[PDB]
Design a protein around this ligand. Structure first.
Ligand SMILES: *[C@@H]1O[C@H](CO)[C@@H](O)[C@H](O)[C@H]1NC(C)=O
Ligand SMILES: *[C@@H]1O[C@H](CO)[C@@H](O)[C@H](O)[C@H]1NC(C)=O
Ligand SMILES: *[C@@H]1O[C@H](CO)[C@@H](O)[C@H](O)[C@H]1NC(C)=O
Lengths: 41, 54, 351, 351
């Protein structure tokens, strides 16, 4: 939900590296883990 | 053994000999049969240790 | 029919039996997801928060080191910013599990730091650069400071790296729980327990508590064996939390003192070289919240039966085949246990 | 010590124990070879004799076909000798187990036979050879004769080939018996039963009959399971013997009649082509002698104990650890059973 009720707000989306999770020095997930977009309420 | 990615692995051609192996997919809609693979186990010819001279 | 044992007539065909089987599979998966969702979201939240917090710590420490370079050694900037940025970039890459050598980080840091110190602070006035880099280690100009920082930061960075990997593997196994495919026999038993009563024309009859118990203890015989390893995982994580913020934040003081130490012997050094050339609170709350789920795998069949519609009284209930007055009475699991054993060994070896 | 249970003192070290173990291995292998030698030589002799007898039959049949070509169709020689020799060479190669196509033998025979018939018998007077070879099959000049010979000879040649393959596989499994390596536990038990009495200073004491029985039934638990399949092998071979000499020897009459048949329509054929272009006794004695060894695998531990030095009275004997007054009381095998199952199915399908 947009944290700010009136004006510029925020919306977050998480993307974890757990399917599968790296083990014994496996290469970690490539790119970004969080996504943020500006919203107007 | 049956694998999660639909594969039939045979380690030794002894406990599972030749045959017409066929893959069949089953669903709530219907069933579908794949083209049967003719898996034949072959034994290569192996001579013998020499005998004594007559 | 191949699932619904036909005692009398029946209101359902074979295709309706397949529909009931698929709905049984989906209902079981939904119940497992509902059981695992709270713990999954707890560990996901904590993994994300700790990752961002460690990145904040690394950024703040790089900023503090850069600021103290700007303030105390303006003659070493802007080259100081380059090697500090490279050092803390490699720091973050190591924290996030990349193959980085800590000794190599510190050694490249001092290798880059010594030539600018020599050219700007000791002998004011690029091709000779490698001779200075070699003399740095050959003459041990920084004394014991490089090995001190090496151990100081390796000890904390390794425990942090293993903490993050442990959180991620817990997320992985909790994700595995709700996708556990079961036997065909269990599919048919769940179909009988949940739906086969509808084939006999009953509308609101629920299965017996004891029948749910026998069915659940029937197909969860493998999943319950994970409980020992999950408990050991929880306890080993508790062993590990009982470290990296203080070290990275004192790095600037250590580097400043090392620069003073090198400047102390400038007389001999210049001539020889001229000739020669709230975190702990968060992990505590996380462990105290994680200990509330130590019974997760052992209480799981109890959850499935206590959240499915069942006749607890075992009176006027469905026993899988008839309405009774009283009731009569690995590969994926192996991978879960393998990864739990691996992470538990890795945990226990650290502390 | 790791084999000799030291109850009192001991007269032997660990190296002497290893020597006793290797001598136990050699003694067991020698006993198995002595048990298997009579049957091995029987099957080897019969395989060799039947091979030579079949080769004699094939040579005599080729000679008879060549003689009837010399006598009845001199115009077809010497080309007739070439295709007859190639045909019977491929016959023998098929009998001896080589990948030869029977239909291809007959078809190449008639393909080679037709052009010389056309050039020397029908139209007297190298590049046009292939047009005649194609016309042979395109116009079906030989009628049903090729398919008649095809089935006639395929039926006999397949049973003879499988007879020889069965003899060879029997040789193989009987050869494997005396090379059967055993478990390490059995090695130590045989060392105790045969030699560990010498480590306790006893000179002529023999092991108890019951102790030999328990040891042998201990390490031959796998070998005894072969007995069912060996019995089925013997009986299936008996099923098969209850055929090829008469066929190969009547081949000349069949070919002569086919040549007459082709010459019968020469009028139309020439114009169209000009425009277009004691054995049975031996196998019976072999089966009757082979049925005397049907108990070979079941009587094998009895043989090992009855041919090893043992105290049959079970009085004043060695029990593996002490001298008593009275006694208290596999991958290669899988391969043997697999090949026996295969050859038995092949046998039963033939007859
Ligand atoms: C297998 O398939 C072949 C051809 O694809 C066929 O001739 C044979 O009779 C089949 N039957 C089996 C292996 O049972
Ligand atoms: C018996 O086994 C031995 C092992 O060397 C082998 O060399 C010999 O040829 C065998 N006899 C056969 C194959 O019939
Ligand atoms: C550190 O970071 C701040 C911004 O967060 C910046 O204003 C400051 O100049 C830096 N300190 C230095 C470069 O001395």
């Amino acid at each position: 939900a947009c944290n700010v009720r009136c004006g510029r707000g925020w919306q977050k989306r998480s993307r974890t590296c757990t399917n599968p999770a790296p083990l014994n020095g496996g290469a970690f997930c490539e790119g970004m883990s969080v996504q943020k977009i500006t919203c107007t309420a | 053994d049956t694998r999660a990615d639909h594969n039939l692995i045979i380690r030794q051609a002894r406990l599972s000999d030749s045959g017409n192996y066929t893959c069949m997919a089953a669903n709530i809609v219907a069933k579908r049969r794949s083209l049967s693979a003719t898996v034949v186990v072959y034994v290569n010819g192996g001579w013998s240790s020499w005998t004594e001279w007559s | 029919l191949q699932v619904c044992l036909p005692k009398g007539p029946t209101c359902c065909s074979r295709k309706m039996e397949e529909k009931y089987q698929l709905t049984a599979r989906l209902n079981m998966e939904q119940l497992l997801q509902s059981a695992s969702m709270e713990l999954k979201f707890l560990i996901i939240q904590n993994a994300a928060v700790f990752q961002e917090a460690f990145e904040i710590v690394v950024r703040h420490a790089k900023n503090y080191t850069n600021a103290m370079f700007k303030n105390n050694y303006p003659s070493l900037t802007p080259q100081a910013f380059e090697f500090v940025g490279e050092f803390f970039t490699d720091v973050s890459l190591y924290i996030l599990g990349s193959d980085i050598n800590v000794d190599d980080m510190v050694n490249e840091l001092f290798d880059s730091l010594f030539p600018v110190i020599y050219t700007q602070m000791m002998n004011p006035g690029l091709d000779i650069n490698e001779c200075l880099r070699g003399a740095r280690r050959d003459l041990k100009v920084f004394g014991s400071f490089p090995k001190l920082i090496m151990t100081q930061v390796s000890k904390s960075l390794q425990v942090t790296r293993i903490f993050l990997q442990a959180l991620n593997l817990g997320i992985e196994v909790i994700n595995t729980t709700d996708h556990l495919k079961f036997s065909k026999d269990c599919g048919r038993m769940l179909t009988r327990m949940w739906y086969c009563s509808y084939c006999q024309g009953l509308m609101m009859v629920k299965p017996c508590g004891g029948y749910c118990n026998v069915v659940m203890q029937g197909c969860m015989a493998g999943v319950v064996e994970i409980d020992k390893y999950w408990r050991e995982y929880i306890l080993s994580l508790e062993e590990l939390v009982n470290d990296m913020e203080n070290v990275l934040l004192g790095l600037f003081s250590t580097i400043h003192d090392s620069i003073q130490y090198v400047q102390k012997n400038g007389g001999k050094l210049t001539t020889t070289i001229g000739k020669l050339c709230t975190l702990s609170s968060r992990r505590r709350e996380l462990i105290q919240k994680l200990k509330s789920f130590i019974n997760f795998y052992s209480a799981l069949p109890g959850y499935i039966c206590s959240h499915s519609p069942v006749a607890e009284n075992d009176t006027l209930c469905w026993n899988g085949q008839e309405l009774v007055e009283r009731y009569s009475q690995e590969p994926v699991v192996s991978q879960i246990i393998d990864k739990l054993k691996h992470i538990n060994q890795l945990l226990r070896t650290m502390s």
